[PDB]
Design a protein around this ligand. Structure first.
Ligand SMILES: *[C@](O)(C(=O)N1CCC1)[C@H](C[C@@H]1CCNC1=O)NC(=O)[C@@H]1[C@@H]2[C@H](CN1C(=O)[C@@H](NC(=O)C(F)(F)F)C(C)(C)C)C2(C)C
Ligand SMILES: *[C@](O)(C(=O)N1CCC1)[C@H](C[C@@H]1CCNC1=O)NC(=O)[C@@H]1[C@@H]2[C@H](CN1C(=O)[C@@H](NC(=O)C(F)(F)F)C(C)(C)C)C2(C)C
Ligand SMILES: [Cl-]
Lengths: 306, 306
């Protein structure tokens, strides 16, 4: 029993983290086989960043201008290119600790673990969601750029995020490992704001199933609703629409608990309209929307990774 | 910016996790040099556990009765002994991935990362506090016994917890790595309950400093209090007393923000007496007491580990 915000074990990713220095700019890189991936603004000075011509700044750089260190070992850069907002430094050594891996672009609503790094060294690991507005609620100081987010499937590390920037309200924005930004953000120091966020409804229902599984059942009412009459109430409280796909994804938790998805929707509708009257669910006084149906199953069934 | 419940990178501990089977009981072990440490109730059947004579059950076991696997490799047990509630299995292979390490018994109030494991395989990592009542608010299913909690200091893994049991209310109890229980718990299936818990005051103040650092300042009032007049109010709300030691430990955060500890105590006193009137601090609608002053500094200054 118990329910915690739980990250993936970080060991497979720790073995891939390096320090990339270009002039006076240092940040983190990801060393997979004989390539180091980092944010392309490693090639900027802190004033270049107002409006940089990246293609131009890169022209002016030789392989030796990039200092890549993996612990006390310097790796020799023998090639360099730009793929969207990500630099690729071909190095002369294949990473012996390269795990089995994939590059994935995740969808809004999906979670991942962030391995926060400074100077190519891991600081800590936490779990995040890709928000409907394509931000994450991260913890990153100056130096964390190039930190990555990932999922583990048994032996396979699925890289989905590389950290680039911090937006007003202290939320974070970055790229997939092909260097395309999540959401409309650009890698330049200008006025950018997150769209208004929404609550990830399917995730709140998954968390309510987690509460039932752990014995926290006070909020279950005796009613049902139609999908249509749920999504009208949801809309008022800035909850994203629940789709039939979402209902199908909640199938396992619904079957395990014997509570129909539309019955749980009836309980969430009452919580949204009446609030929690000072009660908690799984220790929390606010509805949680950063656990996916898969995250709930993993934690409440003990799925492991090699 | 941002503030997250952040675990230590788990890679150093992942390399030490093994599966220990004795008959029909499987759980996790910690492989350091040529010793595997596990909970001693690996030697019980699920009915032995009502009231086991451990010294007796162990007499009856030969080295070959313990099946230790590290991935697809079987490790040969060549010796076995009991140290309090922990088994030590001497194996014929020193763990090549043994990190630099220590066994520490932590104090109530201190945090650590748990690497939750099933069948010697890591499931996930999360951060916990040793509660004043010597429980942790963990996430553990059947199979998680032998999972460990740890701190990393740069290169050194400080092992402080090994998981044994689950108490009423879904909280967790276990031992240091010398096999002595935290709190009054015994490794037998009987009626045991956690003492009433208290809130870790020094940790709530550290979290309030984290909020100020991140720009969440609405709760700062214009008043001060004496330590004595704070600890009287604290007592009503089941907060532990704040000591001068606690005040000294909050020194760095106080200096960084320019808010005297006794001024922050004045702000916490008002929050306890008036509640939060539906406002949040760092995204939270309840006061958080599972971040130490050190945890706040680490996260808000970017301390890393090799
Ligand atoms: C990242 O570059 C880094 O860690 N570095 C060490 C040297 C470079 C850094 C991470 C940021 C800093 C504070 N917290 C973080 O996570 N990213 C940037 O500084 C980022 C680079 C410039 C401007 N960046 C920003 O993050 C800025 N944001 C914005 O302009 C905006 F969000 F408002 F749009 C600032 C610094 C204002 C937060 C570029 C985007 C190329
Ligand atoms: C642990 O043994 C384990 O993971 N195993 C796989 C085979 C053994 C297990 C972990 C528990 C189970 C549910 N969640 C957990 O974290 N620990 C025990 O089962 C533990 C063993 C017996 C009885 N144990 C208990 O945890 C029980 N608790 C209590 O009796 C008490 F807390 F109320 F006191 C139960 C099973 C009721 C939760 C011993 C303490 C030796
Ligand atoms: Cl909360």
């Amino acid at each position: 029993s118990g329910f915690r915000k739980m990250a993936f074990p970080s060991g497979k990713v720790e073995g891939c983290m390096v320090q990339v220095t270009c002039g006076t700019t240092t940040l983190n890189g990801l060393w997979l086989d004989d390539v180091v991936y980092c944010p392309r603004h490693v090639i900027c000075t802190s004033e270049d960043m107002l409006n940089p011509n990246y293609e131009d700044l890169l022209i002016r750089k030789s392989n030796h201008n990039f200092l890549v260190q993996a612990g006390n070992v310097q790796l020799r850069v023998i090639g360099h290119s730009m793929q969207n907002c990500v630099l690729k430094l071909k190095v002369d050594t294949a990473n012996p600790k390269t795990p089995k891996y994939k590059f994935v672009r995740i969808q809004p609503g999906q979670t991942f673990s962030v391995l926060a790094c400074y100077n190519g060294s891991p600081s800590g690991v936490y779990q995040c969601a890709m928000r409907p507005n394509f931000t994450i609620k991260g913890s990153f100081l100056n130096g964390a750029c190039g930190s990555v987010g990932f999922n583990i499937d048994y032996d396979c590390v699925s890289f989905c995020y590389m950290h680039h920037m911090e937006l007003p309200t202290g939320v974070h924005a970055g790229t997939d490992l092909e260097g395309n930004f999540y959401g409309p953000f650009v890698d330049r120091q200008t006025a950018q704001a997150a769209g208004t966020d929404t609550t990830i409804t399917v995730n709140v229902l998954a968390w309510l199933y987690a509460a039932v599984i752990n014995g926290d059942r006070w909020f279950l009412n005796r009613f049902t609703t139609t999908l249509n009459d749920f999504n009208l109430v949801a809309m008022k409280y800035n909850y994203e629409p629940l789709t039939q796909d979402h209902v199908d994804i909640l199938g396992p938790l619904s079957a395990q608990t014997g509570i129909a998805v539309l019955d749980m929707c009836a309980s969430l509708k009452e919580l949204l309209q009446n609030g929690m009257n000072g009660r908690t669910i799984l220790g929390s006084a606010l509805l949680e929307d950063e656990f996916t149906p898969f995250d709930v199953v993993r934690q409440c069934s003990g799925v492991t990774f090699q």
